From a paper:
The difference in affinity between 3 and 2, between adenine and adenosine, and between 8-aminoadenine and 8-aminoadenosine illustrates the importance of the ribose group in nucleotide binding. In addition, we found an intriguing difference between the HSC70-NBD conformations of the adenine/adenosine, 8-aminoadenine/8-aminoadenosine and triciribine fragment/triciribine structural pairs. In the three structures with the ligands without the ribose, the phosphate-binding loop 2, which protrudes from the IIA NBD-subdomain and is one of two phosphate-binding loops characteristic for the actin ATPase family, adopts a distorted β-hairpin conformation similar to that in the nucleotide-free HSC70-NBD/BAG1 structure. In this conformation, the peptide groups between Gly201 and Gly202 and between Gly202 and Gly203 are flipped relative to the nucleotide-bound conformation of phosphate-binding loop 2. By contrast, and to our surprise, in all HSC70-NBD/BAG1 structures bound to carbocycle-containing ligands and small fragments, phosphate-binding loop 2 adopts the distorted conformation also present in the nucleotide-free HSC70-NBD/BAG1.
Author numbering:
A (entry chain A): 1 to 381
B (entry chain B): 150 to 261
Write the structure that this text describes.
């Protein structure tokens, strides 16, 4: 295989994305399964090691030896408030090894412990491979992004994750900086630009304020919710259809994991449809106790069910405008990152707050970070 | 009153029917093995080890089946598509009878 170009990688909490700059445009690479984003999952079995889609797929079969959320552990000490808070919701073990956390799995019949960067490296190798498969070229050089709030330890460990993976990590840049680079807000007219990045995706909510002074991005403030994402909107849709099935038939399906699974799955699909259509229909034969569940949900209802959650995304926007010492009217550009920003109510609430100002949503939100990191990789090439 | 549009939804359900058959074959082998261990001449001490060795396969079969149901659950069939709705209901009921046999395998292995 011939030598390839440099790539941009967005190493996310739930999904990672890889892009390459070619023919004067960024191409986001689809994996072996044809997916443009790959799960941040590594599963250990009796016979093999599964990464990405194949790890995500077997989770239900093997929940204890399927690792995800390593990014939440990366660069953190075991005694970190965030580490002890999160391990209570993981089906995998996290152990204290000299103050450093380590996941504890059962791999090929043996008890194996891995540092968070070793997990994150296996994921990175997958990203590297995805690109190597598409281009038919050996990929070594890469630009990996990290959140703006990531400290020195969290940053170095991510670069350590890139190293173990066998990537010549050209640079580590911020996720808000990469999303801004993707829209070329650094190439714009005027002297100082105040950028607000609204990132609702990857099971996290990050509100960043940036200032582009002569092409130098400065992070003025950071706000948000580390446990607010798509899943919360789904939980509300799930509770709605459980209650509805209760008023319809006087039967509780919550105890049945399979009926809840089927309903939650259609609820994820019905939500996506509600971002481009004002109504979504659901037909589930023999859902619970032999009953067929044929129902529908409007965009107006989905909005009502998440009304407090949706409106609440602006508290961080107000909190970030405070800490950056800027009025809303001083914001030159708004950037939409993450899949949940596709929600028309989120776009409208954020547009009305900025007094009808246009939002930057043209670049797929899920790909905006990787798109920016790939532009950066080409520049450093 | 048969529509060409229905033929499209019938082809989807036929392909899903053949996918069920493939997973049903895997279930069939597990059941023959299970029946074989339970009724077989294996040393009693060993029998438990032989039973638990079906865990990974049974759990895979159940997941494959759950995935089949989620592919079926994406179908929107109008009233007039009477044959597709009967074919749809039939397959779900068959995958459910298959899943309830899987639960039986699970109830007979790795017990303590
Ligand atoms: N189309 C979409 N609408 C709403 N939430 C989403 N999350 C990812 N894609 C989405």
């Amino acid at each position: 295989m011939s030598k390839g170009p440099a790539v941009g990688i967005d190493l996310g909490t739930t999904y990672s994305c890889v892009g390459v700059f070619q023919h004067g445009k960024v191409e986001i690479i689809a994996n072996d399964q044809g997916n443009r984003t790959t799960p941040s999952y590594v599963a250990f079995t009796d016979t093999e090691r599964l990464i990405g889609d194949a790890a995500k797929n077997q989770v239900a079969m093997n929940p204890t030896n399927t690792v995800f959320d390593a990014k939440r552990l990366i660069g953190r000490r075991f005694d970190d408030a965030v580490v002890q808070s999160d391990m209570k919701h993981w089906p995998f073990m996290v152990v204290n090894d000299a103050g450093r956390p380590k996941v504890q799995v059962e791999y090929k019949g043996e008890t194996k412990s891995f540092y968070p960067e070793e997990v994150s490296s296996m994921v990175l190798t997958k990203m590297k491979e995805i690109a190597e498969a598409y281009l038919g070229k050996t990929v070594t050089n890469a630009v990996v992004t990290v959140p703006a709030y990531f400290n020195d330890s969290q940053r170095q460990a991510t670069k350590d994750a890139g190293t173990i993976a066998g990537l010549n990590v050209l640079r580590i840049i911020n996720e808000p900086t990469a999303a801004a680079i993707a829209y070329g807000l650094d190439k714009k007219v005027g002297a100082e630009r105040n950028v607000l990045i609204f990132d609702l995706g990857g099971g996290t909510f990050d509100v960043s304020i940036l200032t582009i002074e002569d092409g130098i991005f400065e992070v003025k403030s950071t706000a948000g919710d580390t446990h607010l994402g798509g899943e919360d909107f789904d939980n509300r849709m799930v509770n709605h259809f459980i209650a509805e099935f209760k008023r319809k038939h006087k039967k509780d399906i919550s105890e049945n994991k399979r009926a809840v699974r089927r309903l939650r799955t259609a609820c994820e699909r019905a939500k996506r449809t509600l971002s481009s259509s004002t109504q979504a229909s659901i037909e589930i034969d023999s859902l619970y106790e032999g009953i067929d569940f044929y129902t529908s949900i409007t965009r107006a209802r989905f909005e009502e069910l998440n009304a407090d959650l949706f409106r609440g995304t602006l508290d961080p926007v107000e909190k970030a405008l405070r800490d950056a010492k800027l009025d809303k009217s001083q914001i030159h550009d708004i950037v939409l990152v993450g899949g949940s920003t596709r929600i028309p109510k989120i776009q409208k609430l954020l547009q009305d707050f900025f007094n009808g100002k246009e939002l930057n949503k043209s670049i797929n939100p899920d790909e905006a970070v990787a798109y920016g990191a790939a532009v950066q990789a080409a520049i450093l090439s | 009153s048969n529509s060409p549009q229905e033929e499209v939804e019938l082809k989807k359900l036929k392909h899903l029917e053949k996918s069920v058959e493939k997973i049903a074959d895997q279930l069939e082998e597990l059941n023959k093995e299970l029946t074989g261990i339970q009724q077989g001449f294996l040393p009693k001490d060993l029998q438990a080890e032989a039973l638990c060795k079906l865990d990974r396969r049974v759990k895979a079969t159940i997941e494959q089946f759950m995935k089949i149901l989620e592919e079926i659950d994406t179908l929107i069939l109008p009233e007039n598509f009477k044959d597709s709705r009967l074919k749809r209901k039939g397959l779900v009921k068959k995958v459910q009878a298959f899943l309830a046999e899987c639960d039986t395998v699970e109830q007979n292995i790795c017990q303590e």
